[PDB]
Paper text:
Neutrophils figure prominently in human host defense against infection, and optimal antimicrobial action in neutrophils relies on the action of hypochlorous acid (HOCl), the product of the myeloperoxidase (MPO)4-H2O2-chloride system.
We present the high-resolution crystal structure of proMPO recombinantly produced by CHO cells and demonstrate how the flexible propeptide blocks dimerization by the formation of a disulfide bridge between Cys-158 from the propeptide and Cys-319. Because an SDS-PAGE of the crystals demonstrated the presence of the full-length protein, this clearly suggests that the propeptide exhibits a high flexibility compared with the core of the protein (Thr-166–Ala-744). The segment of the propeptide visible in the electron density of proMPO is anchored to the core protein via a cystine bridge (Cys-158–Cys-319) together with polar and hydrophobic interactions, resulting in a buried surface area of 399 Å2. The same disulfide bridges are found in mature MPO, with Cys-167–Cys-180 located in the L-chain and the remaining disulfide bridges belong to the H-chain of leukocyte MPO. However, most interestingly, Cys-319 of proMPO, which is known to form an interchain disulfide bridge between the H-chains of the symmetry-related halves (74 kDa) in dimeric MPO (compare with Fig. 1A), formed a disulfide bridge with Cys-158 of the propeptide. The crystal structure of proMPO shows that the stretch 273ASFVTG278 was part of a surface-exposed α-helix loop segment with all six amino acids surface exposed (accessible surface areas follow the hierarchy Phe-275 > Gly-278 > Val-276 > Ala-273 > Ser-274 > Thr-277). The structure of proMPO that we reported here fully supports these findings, because it demonstrates that its core structure, including the substrate access channel and heme cavity architecture, was almost identical to that of the protomer of mature MPO.
Residue numbers in the entry: 157 to 744
The structure:
């Protein structure tokens, strides 16, 4: 992750497809957006020592004039709420949550050292509570609702430093993925992985499929071969390993696995149709042309259907005006802050995985499973009915609504990864510790970056949040709004009209997606990428149709899948939805 690496790469004078790593998207600066490089910083890093130590590291060292709040204390006092009072979102489906996670996994993955590598550096962060690099465990406050022993801790490994061993540079972190919206969560962001994901036994251009199991005759993802596979720890008698995909997190919840599996099937379906249309195309051509369509589908669903429902209309117009042209001066890298701000989606998570049968009725015997029993539970996809019941549950049940007194559920705040760790983790608290690990500036620095007022007093914060009660709780924890961690402040803001983030997150997220679009030479609407006939055909795609084409589901949401969420009111027969017409891909 040193910036000088690959500075001298020359891009081919002409090319036809994206590289796997993202290299050579920008011909003038070929490393922009390429994988395994440092995040860009939109603001200078803020560390306790100005260089690398995170705020909270050294006892007694203040931040901006006030003591650092324990991340777990903030979670306990601000985020915790009684699950029985959860508010369903009347205007978003659970698919709105799940697309956000899948999309995140096209954009950024921040590596950290493995427990396996603790041999190199003393402390195993998974089992020890000692604060020694690379560990930065979360301390336990007094009166914790779950962890009564204050000598315990929540495990935490610091993110890998970019360019370790440099003594002059402020610590930064690495994005292992291509920043572009290019379906790298399907295809991989590194060349060896990308080849291993492909079926190289024939000339059909397919992605490899599971060789042990099928889902009512349809493909599943291949199994991965991991050291310390967490999926094996969920159902220990079944011993079903994690799945292999373009991104390493595909097994983290079966709803996410289902989306990965859907896109795998869609690739193979497209490659099959393109072979029929163009019998002389070899496997490499079929793979690249199918991959190019899948990437465009991800871009279309994301920008046409998803982002307007995140940002709301006024923030769309401000941060994502109509596309005009590719500009090679636009920096398409993921910003460090985005890795934390886009975790707003944790506020959308429901405490169960839901499964519905082919009458859209709760699927017996167990129509809902607590989320803390589905993490890494790849066995549930293989042995409990495949992806159809999960996809129905995503379409037909609501997202959780973010409310200022109902921020995130205890299935992730108290029981994250409980089956596979020595202790349940607290995802909101991890988000806050991670922002400190990454040296991110606090709430007001980001407000300033976004051109928004910076409240200083409890009364000013109450005005910004339109909630004096919440402002008082934040001030009691943090002392000053300058110290509120970006995720916590971002998700505390009242939501934009017809959106699901407030002004600060709308700015950060909208800015990021504008750069990913305007700085992408392979953006699907850029002149020359597709023909005009192909662009017209692609405008007909939708996530409901992809579901129709690749599953046993024959009744699906009406368009906006992310808004539709109530059956049968919002549903139609697949027979009424035109399939993507590939006629304009025919080459004589
Ligand atoms: C690379 O791409 C090729 C071509 O697509 C793949 O080949 C197919 O792989 C699938 C998945 O394993 C094969 O499916 C299975 O067929 C078994 C019988 O095979 C015979 O019959 C077919 C014709 O129908 C022939 O093509 C084949 O050569 C065999 O003669 C069935 O017994 C299987 O069903 C059982 O297993 C599944 C789990 O796998 C259970 O769910 C079922 O309940 C049942 O117990 C299964 O249907 C398919 O036959 C292959 N086709 C061809 C043409 O080769 C490669 O798999 C792929 N490689 C990779 C790594 O992805
Ligand atoms: C089943 C749903 C989800 C999870 C399980 C889950 C879990 C995590 C974890 C454990 C992390 C890392 C925590 C840490 O810092 O140690 C994490 C990071 C990120 N998320 Fe989470 N997430 C689930 C769901 C979502 C949704 C719906 C998201 C967005 C709409 C979302 C985003 C993100 C992002 C961007 C990150 C950082 C990724 C990176 O490494 O760069 N997640 N999530
Ligand atoms: C682990 O997975 C196994 C295998 O699917 C589960 O066992 C099945 O459970 C159902 C319901 O009780 C039975 O009808 C099957 O006959 C069982 N199969 C086998 C091979 O035992 C088991 O319940 C799962 N365990 C946990 C803890 O989730
Ligand atoms: C690509 O984007 C850059 C950045 O906006 C454009 O350069 C700006 O152009 C305007 C209008 O001519 C000038 O007023 C600015 O001073 C320029 N800024 C910089 C940093 O050069 C550039 O014109 C765009 N390219 C195309 C083809 O539209
Ligand atoms: C960084 O500092 C360490 C310890 O002082 C030293 O061993 C190493 O040579 C330094 N690195 C560079 C590039 O000077
Ligand atoms: C969907 O439409 C097809 C074609 O008209 C029809 O055969 C099928 O029965 C319909 N399915 C449902 C569930 O309405
Ligand atoms: Ca990508
Ligand atoms: Cl940043
Ligand atoms: Cl470290
Ligand atoms: Cl396999
Ligand atoms: Cl409140
Ligand atoms: Cl159905």
């Amino acid at each position: 992750g040193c910036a000088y690496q690959d500075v001298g790469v020359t891009c081919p004078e002409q090319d036809k497809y994206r590289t796997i790593t993202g290299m050579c998207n920008n011909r003038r600066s070929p490393t922009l957006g390429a994988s395994n490089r440092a995040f860009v910083r939109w603001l200078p890093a803020e560390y306790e020592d100005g260089f690398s130590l995170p705020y909270g590291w050294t006892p007694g060292v203040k931040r901006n004039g006030f003591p650092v709040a324990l991340a777990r204390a903030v979670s306990n006092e601000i985020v915790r709420f009684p699950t029985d009072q959860l508010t369903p979102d009347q205007e978003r489906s659970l698919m709105f949550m799940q697309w956000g996670q899948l999309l995140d996994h096209d954009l950024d993955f921040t590596p950290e050292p493995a427990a396996r590598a603790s041999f190199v550096t003393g402390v195993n962060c998974e089992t020890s509570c000692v604060q020694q690099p690379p560990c930065f465990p979360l301390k336990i406050p007094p009166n914790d609702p779950r962890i009564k022993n204050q000598a315990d801790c929540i495990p935490f490994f610091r993110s890998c430093p970019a360019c370790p061993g440099s003594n002059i540079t402020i610590r930064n972190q690495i994005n292992a993925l291509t920043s572009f919206v290019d379906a790298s969560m399907v295809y991989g962001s590194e060349e060896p992985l990308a080849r291993n994901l492909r079926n190289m036994s024939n000339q059909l251009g397919l992605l490899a499929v599971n060789q042990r199991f099928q889902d009512n005759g349809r493909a599943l993802l291949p199994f991965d071969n991991l050291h310390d596979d967490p999926c094996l720890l969920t159902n220990r008698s079944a011993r079903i390993p994690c799945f292999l995909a373009g991104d390493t997190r595909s097994s983290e919840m079966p709803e996410l696995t289902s989306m990965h599996t859907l896109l795998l099937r869609e690739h193979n379906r497209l490659a099959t149709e393109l072979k029929s249309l163009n019998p002389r195309w070899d496997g490499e051509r079929l793979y690249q042309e199918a991959r190019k369509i899948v990437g465009a589908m991800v871009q279309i669903i994301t920008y046409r259907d998803y982002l307007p429902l995140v940002l709301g209309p006024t923030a769309m117009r401000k941060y994502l005006p109509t596309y005009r042209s590719y500009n090679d001066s636009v920096d398409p890298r993921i910003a460090n802050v985005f890795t934390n701000a886009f975790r707003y989606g944790h506020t959308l998570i429901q405490p169960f995985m839901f499964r519905l049968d082919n009458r859209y009725q709760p699927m017996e015997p167990n129509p809902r499973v607590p989320l803390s029993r589905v993490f890494f539970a790849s066995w549930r996809v293989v042995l409990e009915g495949g992806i159809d019941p999960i996809l129905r549950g995503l379409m037909a049940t609501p997202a959780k609504l973010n409310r200022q007194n109902q921020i995130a559920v205890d299935e992730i705040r108290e029981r994250l990864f409980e089956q596979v760790m020595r202790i349940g983790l607290d995802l909101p608290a991890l988000n806050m510790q991670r922002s400190r690990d990454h040296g991110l500036p606090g709430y007001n620095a980001w407000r300033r970056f976004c051109g928004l007022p910076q409240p200083e007093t409890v009364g000013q914060l109450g005005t910004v949040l339109r909630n004096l009660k919440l402002a008082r709780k934040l001030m009691e924890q943090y002392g000053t709004p300058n110290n509120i961690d970006i995720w916590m402040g971002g998700v505390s803001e009242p939501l934009k009209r017809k959106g699901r983030v407030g002004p600060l997150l709308a700015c950060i997220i909208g800015t990021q997606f504008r750069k990913l679009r305007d700085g992408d030479r392979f953006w699907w609407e850029n002149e020359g990428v597709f023909s005009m006939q192909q662009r017209q055909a692609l405008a007909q795609i939708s996530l409901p149709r992809i579901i129709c084409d690749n599953t046993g589901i024959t009744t699906v949401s009406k368009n906006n899948i992310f808004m539709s969420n109530s059956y049968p009111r919002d549903f139609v027969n697949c027979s009424t939805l035109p399939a993507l017409n590939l006629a304009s891909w025919r080459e004589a």
